[PDB]
Short mmCIF file of C-alpha atoms and ligand atoms in Angstrom, two decimals:
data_model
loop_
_atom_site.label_atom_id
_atom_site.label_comp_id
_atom_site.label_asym_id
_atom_site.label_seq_id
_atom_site.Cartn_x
_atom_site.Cartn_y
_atom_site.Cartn_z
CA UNK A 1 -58.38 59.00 -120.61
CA UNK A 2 -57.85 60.85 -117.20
CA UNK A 3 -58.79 62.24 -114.22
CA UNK A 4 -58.50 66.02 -113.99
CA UNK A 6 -56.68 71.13 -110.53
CA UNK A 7 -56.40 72.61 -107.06
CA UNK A 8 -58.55 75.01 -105.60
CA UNK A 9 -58.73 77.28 -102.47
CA UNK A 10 -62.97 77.34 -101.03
CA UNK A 11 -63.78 80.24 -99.54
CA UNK A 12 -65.89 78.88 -96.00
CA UNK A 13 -66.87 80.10 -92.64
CA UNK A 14 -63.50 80.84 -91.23
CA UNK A 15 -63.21 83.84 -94.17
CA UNK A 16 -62.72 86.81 -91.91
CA UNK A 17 -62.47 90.35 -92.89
CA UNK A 18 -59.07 92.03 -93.38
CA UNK A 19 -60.17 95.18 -92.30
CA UNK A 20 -60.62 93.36 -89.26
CA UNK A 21 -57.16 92.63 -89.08
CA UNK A 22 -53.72 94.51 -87.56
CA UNK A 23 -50.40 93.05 -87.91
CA UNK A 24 -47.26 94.37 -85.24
CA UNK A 25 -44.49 92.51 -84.18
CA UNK A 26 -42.64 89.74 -86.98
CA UNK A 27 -42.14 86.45 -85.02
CA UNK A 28 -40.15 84.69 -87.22
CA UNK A 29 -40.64 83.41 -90.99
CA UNK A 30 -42.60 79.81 -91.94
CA UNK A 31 -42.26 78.27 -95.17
CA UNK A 32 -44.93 79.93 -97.01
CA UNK A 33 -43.84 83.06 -95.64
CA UNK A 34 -43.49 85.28 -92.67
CA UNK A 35 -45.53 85.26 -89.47
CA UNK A 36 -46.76 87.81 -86.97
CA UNK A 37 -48.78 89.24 -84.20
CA UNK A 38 -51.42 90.50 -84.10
CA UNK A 39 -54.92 91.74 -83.23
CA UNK A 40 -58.21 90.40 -84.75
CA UNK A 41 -61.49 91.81 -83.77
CA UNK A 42 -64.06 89.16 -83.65
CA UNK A 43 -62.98 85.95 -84.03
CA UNK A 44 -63.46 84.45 -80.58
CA UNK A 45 -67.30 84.89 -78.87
CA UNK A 46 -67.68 87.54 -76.54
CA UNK A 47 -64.30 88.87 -77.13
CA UNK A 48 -64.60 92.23 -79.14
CA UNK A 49 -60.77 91.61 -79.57
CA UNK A 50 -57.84 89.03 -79.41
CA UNK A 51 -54.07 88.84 -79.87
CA UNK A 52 -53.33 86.26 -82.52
CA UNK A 53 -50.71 85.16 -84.39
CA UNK A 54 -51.27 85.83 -88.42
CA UNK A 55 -49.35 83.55 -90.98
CA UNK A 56 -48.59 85.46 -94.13
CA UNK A 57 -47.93 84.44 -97.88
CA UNK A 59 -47.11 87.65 -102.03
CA UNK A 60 -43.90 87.54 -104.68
CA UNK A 61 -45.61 83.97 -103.87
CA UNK A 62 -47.34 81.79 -106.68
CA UNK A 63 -51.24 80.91 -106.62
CA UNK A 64 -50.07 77.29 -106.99
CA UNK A 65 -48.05 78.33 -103.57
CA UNK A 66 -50.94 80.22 -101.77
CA UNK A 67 -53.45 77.74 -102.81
CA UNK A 68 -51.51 74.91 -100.86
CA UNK A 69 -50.53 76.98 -97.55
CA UNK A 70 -54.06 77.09 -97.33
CA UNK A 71 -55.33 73.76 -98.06
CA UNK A 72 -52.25 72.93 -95.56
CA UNK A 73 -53.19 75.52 -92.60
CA UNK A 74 -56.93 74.15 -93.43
CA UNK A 75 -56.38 71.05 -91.86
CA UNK A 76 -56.65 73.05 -88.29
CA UNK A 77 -60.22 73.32 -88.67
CA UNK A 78 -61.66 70.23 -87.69
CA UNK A 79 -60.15 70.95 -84.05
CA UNK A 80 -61.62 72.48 -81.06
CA UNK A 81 -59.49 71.86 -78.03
CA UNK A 82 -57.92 73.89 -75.45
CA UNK A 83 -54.99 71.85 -75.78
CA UNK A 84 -54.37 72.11 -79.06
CA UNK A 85 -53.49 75.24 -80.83
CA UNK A 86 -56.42 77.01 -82.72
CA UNK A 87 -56.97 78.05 -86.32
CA UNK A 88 -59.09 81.83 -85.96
CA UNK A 89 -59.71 82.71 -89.30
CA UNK A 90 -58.50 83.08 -93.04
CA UNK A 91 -57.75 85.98 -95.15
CA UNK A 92 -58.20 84.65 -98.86
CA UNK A 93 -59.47 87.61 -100.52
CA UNK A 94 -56.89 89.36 -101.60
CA UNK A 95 -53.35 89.96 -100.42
CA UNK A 96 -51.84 88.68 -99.12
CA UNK A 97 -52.93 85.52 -98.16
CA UNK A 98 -53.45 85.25 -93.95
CA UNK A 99 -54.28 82.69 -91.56
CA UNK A 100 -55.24 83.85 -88.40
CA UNK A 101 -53.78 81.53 -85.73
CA UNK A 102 -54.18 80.92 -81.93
CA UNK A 103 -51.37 83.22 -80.32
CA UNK A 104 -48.91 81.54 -78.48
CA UNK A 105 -46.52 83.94 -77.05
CA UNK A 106 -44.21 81.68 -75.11
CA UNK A 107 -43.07 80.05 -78.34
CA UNK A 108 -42.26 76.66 -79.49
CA UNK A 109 -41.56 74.08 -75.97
CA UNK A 110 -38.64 73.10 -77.36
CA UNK A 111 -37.80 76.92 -77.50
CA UNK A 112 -39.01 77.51 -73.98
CA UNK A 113 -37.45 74.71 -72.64
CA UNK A 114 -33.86 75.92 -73.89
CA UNK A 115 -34.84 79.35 -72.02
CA UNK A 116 -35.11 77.80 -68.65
CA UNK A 117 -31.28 76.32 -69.05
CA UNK A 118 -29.09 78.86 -66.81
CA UNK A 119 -27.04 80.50 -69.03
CA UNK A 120 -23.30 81.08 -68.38
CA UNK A 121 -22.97 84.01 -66.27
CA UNK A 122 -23.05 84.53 -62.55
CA UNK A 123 -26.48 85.96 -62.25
CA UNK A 124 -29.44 84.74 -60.00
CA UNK A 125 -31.47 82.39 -62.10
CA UNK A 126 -34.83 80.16 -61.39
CA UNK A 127 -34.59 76.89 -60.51
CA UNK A 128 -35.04 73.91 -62.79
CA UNK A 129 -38.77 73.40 -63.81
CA UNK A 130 -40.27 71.31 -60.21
CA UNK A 131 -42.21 67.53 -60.63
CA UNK A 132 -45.53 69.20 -60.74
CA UNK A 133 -45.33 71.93 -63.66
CA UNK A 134 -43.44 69.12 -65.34
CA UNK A 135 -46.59 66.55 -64.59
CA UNK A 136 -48.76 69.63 -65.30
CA UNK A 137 -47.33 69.69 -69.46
CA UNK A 138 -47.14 66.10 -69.18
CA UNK A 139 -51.02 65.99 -69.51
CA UNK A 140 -51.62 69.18 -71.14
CA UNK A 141 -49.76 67.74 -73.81
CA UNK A 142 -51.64 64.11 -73.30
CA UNK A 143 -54.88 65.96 -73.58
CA UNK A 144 -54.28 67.17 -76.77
CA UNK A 145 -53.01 63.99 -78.26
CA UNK A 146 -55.80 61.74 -76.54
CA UNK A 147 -58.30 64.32 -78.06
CA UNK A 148 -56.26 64.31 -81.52
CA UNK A 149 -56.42 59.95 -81.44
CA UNK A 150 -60.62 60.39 -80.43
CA UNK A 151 -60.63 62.53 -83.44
CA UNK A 152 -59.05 59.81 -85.63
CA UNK A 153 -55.78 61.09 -86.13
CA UNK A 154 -52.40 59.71 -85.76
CA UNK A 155 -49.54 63.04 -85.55
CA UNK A 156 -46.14 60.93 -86.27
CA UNK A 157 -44.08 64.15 -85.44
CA UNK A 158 -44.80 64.29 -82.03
CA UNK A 159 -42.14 66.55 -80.08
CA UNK A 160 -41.50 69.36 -78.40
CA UNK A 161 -40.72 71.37 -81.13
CA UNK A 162 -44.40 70.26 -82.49
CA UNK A 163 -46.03 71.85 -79.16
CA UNK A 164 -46.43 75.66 -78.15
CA UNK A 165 -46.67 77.49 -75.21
CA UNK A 166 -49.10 80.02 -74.37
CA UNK A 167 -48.82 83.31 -72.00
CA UNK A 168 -50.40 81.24 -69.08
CA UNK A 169 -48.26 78.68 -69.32
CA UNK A 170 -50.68 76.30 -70.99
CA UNK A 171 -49.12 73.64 -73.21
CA UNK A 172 -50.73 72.64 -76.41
CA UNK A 173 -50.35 70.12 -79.50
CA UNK A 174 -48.74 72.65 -82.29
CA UNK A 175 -49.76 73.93 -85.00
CA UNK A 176 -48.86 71.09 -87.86
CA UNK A 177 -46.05 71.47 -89.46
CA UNK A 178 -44.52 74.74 -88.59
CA UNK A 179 -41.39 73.63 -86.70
CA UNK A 180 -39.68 71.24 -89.00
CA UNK A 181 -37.24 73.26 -90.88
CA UNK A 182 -35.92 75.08 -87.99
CA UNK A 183 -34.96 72.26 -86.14
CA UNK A 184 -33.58 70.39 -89.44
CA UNK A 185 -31.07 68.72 -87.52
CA UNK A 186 -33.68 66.48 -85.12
CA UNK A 187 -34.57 65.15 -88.83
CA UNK A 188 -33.04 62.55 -91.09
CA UNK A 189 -33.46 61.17 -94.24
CA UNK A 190 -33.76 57.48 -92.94
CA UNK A 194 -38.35 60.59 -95.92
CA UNK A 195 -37.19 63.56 -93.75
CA UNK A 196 -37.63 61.84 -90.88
CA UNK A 197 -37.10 62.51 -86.63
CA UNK A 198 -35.87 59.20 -86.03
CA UNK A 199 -34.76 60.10 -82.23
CA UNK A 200 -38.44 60.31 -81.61
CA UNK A 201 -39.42 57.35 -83.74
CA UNK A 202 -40.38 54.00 -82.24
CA UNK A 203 -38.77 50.65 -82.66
CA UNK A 204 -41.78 49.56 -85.25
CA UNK A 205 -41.93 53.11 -86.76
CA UNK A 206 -38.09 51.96 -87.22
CA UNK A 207 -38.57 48.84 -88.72
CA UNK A 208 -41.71 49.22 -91.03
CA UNK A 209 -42.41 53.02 -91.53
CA UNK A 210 -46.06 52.93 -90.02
CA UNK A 211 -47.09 55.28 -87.28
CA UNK A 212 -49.40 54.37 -84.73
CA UNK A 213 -51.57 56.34 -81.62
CA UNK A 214 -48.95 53.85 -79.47
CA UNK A 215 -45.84 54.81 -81.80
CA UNK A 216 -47.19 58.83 -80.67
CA UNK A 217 -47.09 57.55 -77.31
CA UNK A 218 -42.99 56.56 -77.34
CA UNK A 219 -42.66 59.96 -78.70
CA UNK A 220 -44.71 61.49 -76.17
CA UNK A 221 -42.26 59.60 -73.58
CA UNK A 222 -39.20 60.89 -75.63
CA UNK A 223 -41.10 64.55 -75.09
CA UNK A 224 -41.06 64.28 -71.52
CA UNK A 225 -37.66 63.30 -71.37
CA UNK A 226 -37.52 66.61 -73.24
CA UNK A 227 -38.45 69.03 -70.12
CA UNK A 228 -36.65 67.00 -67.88
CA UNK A 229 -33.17 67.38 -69.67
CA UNK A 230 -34.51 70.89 -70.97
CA UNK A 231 -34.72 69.93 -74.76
CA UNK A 232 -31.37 68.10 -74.88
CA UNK A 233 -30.78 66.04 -78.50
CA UNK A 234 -32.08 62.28 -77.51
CA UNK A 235 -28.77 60.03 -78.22
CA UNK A 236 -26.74 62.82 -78.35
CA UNK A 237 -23.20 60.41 -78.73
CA UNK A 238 -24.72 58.60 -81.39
CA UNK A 239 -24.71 58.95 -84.78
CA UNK A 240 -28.49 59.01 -86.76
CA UNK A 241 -27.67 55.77 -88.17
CA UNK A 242 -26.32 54.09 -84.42
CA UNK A 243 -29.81 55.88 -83.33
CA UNK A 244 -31.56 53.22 -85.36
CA UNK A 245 -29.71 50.14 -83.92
CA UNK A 246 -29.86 51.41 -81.02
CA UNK A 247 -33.67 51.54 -80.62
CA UNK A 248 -34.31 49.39 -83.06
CA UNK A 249 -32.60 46.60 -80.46
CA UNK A 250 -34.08 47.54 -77.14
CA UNK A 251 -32.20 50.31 -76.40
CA UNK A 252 -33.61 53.22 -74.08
CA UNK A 253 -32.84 56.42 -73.23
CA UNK A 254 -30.98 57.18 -69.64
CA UNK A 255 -32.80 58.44 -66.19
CA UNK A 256 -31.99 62.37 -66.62
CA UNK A 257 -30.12 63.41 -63.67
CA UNK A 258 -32.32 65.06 -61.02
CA UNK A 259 -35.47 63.87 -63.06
CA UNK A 260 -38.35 62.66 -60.59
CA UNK A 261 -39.12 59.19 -59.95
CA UNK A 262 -42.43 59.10 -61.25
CA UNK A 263 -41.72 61.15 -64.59
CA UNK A 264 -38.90 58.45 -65.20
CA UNK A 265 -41.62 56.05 -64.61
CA UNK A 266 -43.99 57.60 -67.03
CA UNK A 267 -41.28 57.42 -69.72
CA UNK A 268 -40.64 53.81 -68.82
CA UNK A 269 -44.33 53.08 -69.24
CA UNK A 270 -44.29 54.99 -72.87
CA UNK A 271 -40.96 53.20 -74.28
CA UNK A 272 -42.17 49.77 -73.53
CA UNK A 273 -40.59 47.73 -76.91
CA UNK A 274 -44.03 46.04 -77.51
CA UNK A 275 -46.54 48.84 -79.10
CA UNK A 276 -49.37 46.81 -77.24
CA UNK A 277 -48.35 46.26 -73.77
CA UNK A 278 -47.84 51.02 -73.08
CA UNK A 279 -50.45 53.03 -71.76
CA UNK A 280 -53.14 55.26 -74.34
CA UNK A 281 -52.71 58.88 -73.40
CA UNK A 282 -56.13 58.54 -72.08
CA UNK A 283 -54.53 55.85 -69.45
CA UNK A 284 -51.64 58.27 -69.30
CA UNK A 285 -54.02 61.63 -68.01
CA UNK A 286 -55.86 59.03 -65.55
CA UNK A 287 -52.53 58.06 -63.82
CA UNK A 288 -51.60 61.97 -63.23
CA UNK A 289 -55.03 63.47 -62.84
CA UNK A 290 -54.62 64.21 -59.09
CA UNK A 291 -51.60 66.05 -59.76
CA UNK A 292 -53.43 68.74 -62.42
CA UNK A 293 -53.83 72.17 -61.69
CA UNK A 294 -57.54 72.43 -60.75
CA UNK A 295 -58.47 73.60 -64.02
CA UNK A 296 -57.92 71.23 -65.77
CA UNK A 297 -61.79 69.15 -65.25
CA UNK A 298 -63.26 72.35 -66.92
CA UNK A 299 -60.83 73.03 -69.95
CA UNK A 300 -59.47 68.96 -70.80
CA UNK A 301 -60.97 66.98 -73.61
CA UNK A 302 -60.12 64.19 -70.80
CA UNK A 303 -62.84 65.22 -68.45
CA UNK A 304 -65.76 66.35 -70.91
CA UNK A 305 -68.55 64.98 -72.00
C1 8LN B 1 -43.86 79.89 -82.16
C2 8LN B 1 -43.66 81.12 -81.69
N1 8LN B 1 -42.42 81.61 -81.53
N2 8LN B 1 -42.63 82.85 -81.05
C3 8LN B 1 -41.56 83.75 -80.69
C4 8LN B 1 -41.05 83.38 -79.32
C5 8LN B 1 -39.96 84.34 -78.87
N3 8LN B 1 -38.92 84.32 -79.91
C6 8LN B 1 -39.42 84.76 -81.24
C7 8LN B 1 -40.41 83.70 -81.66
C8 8LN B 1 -43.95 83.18 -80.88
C9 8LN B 1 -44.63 82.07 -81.30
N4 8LN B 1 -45.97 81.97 -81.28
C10 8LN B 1 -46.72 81.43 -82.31
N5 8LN B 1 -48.02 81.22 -82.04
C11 8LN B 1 -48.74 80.70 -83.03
C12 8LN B 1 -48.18 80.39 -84.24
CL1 8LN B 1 -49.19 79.71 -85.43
C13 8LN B 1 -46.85 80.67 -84.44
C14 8LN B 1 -46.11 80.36 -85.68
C15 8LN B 1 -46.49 79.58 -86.75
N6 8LN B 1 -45.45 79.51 -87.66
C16 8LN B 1 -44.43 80.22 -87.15
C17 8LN B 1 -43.11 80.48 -87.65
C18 8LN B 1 -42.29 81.25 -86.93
C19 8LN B 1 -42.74 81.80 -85.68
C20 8LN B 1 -43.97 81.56 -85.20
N7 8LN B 1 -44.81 80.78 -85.93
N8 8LN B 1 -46.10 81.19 -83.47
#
């Protein structure tokens, strides 16, 4: 005959709605809208923290069922460098995740913030070498601690990472970028084929060393401040391009040594570039302080 029905299991991360306050909207996910927040006991020896609450109601239980399932797959993950899942809300409505606050946005977002807009006011300088380096192995962290943890992420990007109030760069919450930025896709499978790699290209299979190009391409990110890779060519030139040894251009003004890094990360043969765990070891003199007592890289 057959095989049989989805289901939504109530576990440990079922938190209290009472315990829950919702304020300002920060924009609207797939499943539904999203906002900040305050929940009161969800991190230890915090009596409260600011956190951002994904919402489902309208909605169908098939609908609900799978934004949880989805947001679910956060649990498995404890790292400072990757964004955190806090708690559900599954009893009753509606339907809440309780999320890691990252006030500072998307990176690809923050980047674009940093670009001097087009008046004839004082503005900061362009992001220096060292806070560059410094979300060069945040970012690492988090994807040499994702790899340890078995997983391959395939949509790495700056888009795909957040930014927190300190500054503090982390691997995104999966998934929750992708429509918004629905031009950096294509349907080669939706697909963001300017951060693909030349086998990801060929054969479709994503590797820890095909998240490493992409890490490269994400680097090449800050230092044009989240231009569009191969932004004269066309999606399907993008392929060729790549595809045949092609490389992205030295940004002008970008560092030596981040140019290097990218070098080292777009290498055509998957084998022959650096693990991100190679990658935090080449940069680890030039991290904040911090960084031995908060990276997956340096613990035990
Ligand atoms: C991603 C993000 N954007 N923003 C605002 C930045 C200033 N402009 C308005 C947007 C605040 C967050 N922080 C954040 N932290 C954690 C999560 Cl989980 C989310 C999140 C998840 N899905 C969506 C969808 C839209 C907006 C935010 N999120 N956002």
């Amino acid at each position: 005959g057959y095989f049989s029905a989805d289901v939504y299991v109530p576990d440990e991360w079922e938190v209290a709605r009472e315990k829950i306050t919702m304020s300002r909207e920060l924009g609207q996910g797939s499943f539904g809208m999203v906002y900040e927040g305050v929940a009161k006991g969800v991190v230890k020896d915090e009596p409260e923290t600011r956190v951002a609450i994904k919402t489902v109601e309208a909605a169908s239980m098939r609908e609900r069922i799978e934004f949880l399932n989805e947001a679910s797959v956060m649990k498995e993950f404890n790292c400072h460098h990757v964004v955190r899942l806090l708690g559900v809300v599954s009893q009753g409505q509606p339907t809440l995740v309780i999320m890691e606050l990252m006030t500072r946005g998307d990176l690809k977002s923050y980047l674009r913030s940093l670009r001097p807009e087009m008046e004839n006011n004082p503005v900061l300088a362009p992001p220096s070498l060292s806070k560059m380096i410094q979300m060069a192995g945040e970012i690492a962290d988090g994807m040499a601690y994702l790899n340890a943890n078995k997983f391959v992420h395939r949509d790495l990007a700056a888009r795909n990472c957040m930014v927190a109030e300190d500054f503090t760069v982390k691997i995104g919450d999966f998934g929750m970028t992708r429509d918004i930025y629905e031009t950096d896709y294509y349907r080669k499978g939706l697909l963001p084929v300017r951060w693909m790699s030349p086998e990801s290209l060929k054969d479709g299979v994503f590797t820890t060393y095909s998240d490493v190009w992409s890490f490269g391409v994400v680097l090449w990110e800050i230092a044009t401040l989240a231009e569009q890779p191969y932004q004269g060519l066309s999606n399907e030139q993008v392929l060729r391009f790549v595809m045949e040894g092609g490389l992205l251009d030295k940004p002008d003004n970008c560092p030596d040594m981040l140019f290097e890094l990218m070098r080292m990360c777009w290498q055509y043969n998957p084998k022959m570039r650096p693990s991100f765990l190679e990658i935090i070891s080449s940069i680890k003199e030039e991290m904040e302080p911090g960084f031995r007592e908060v990276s997956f890289y340096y613990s035990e």
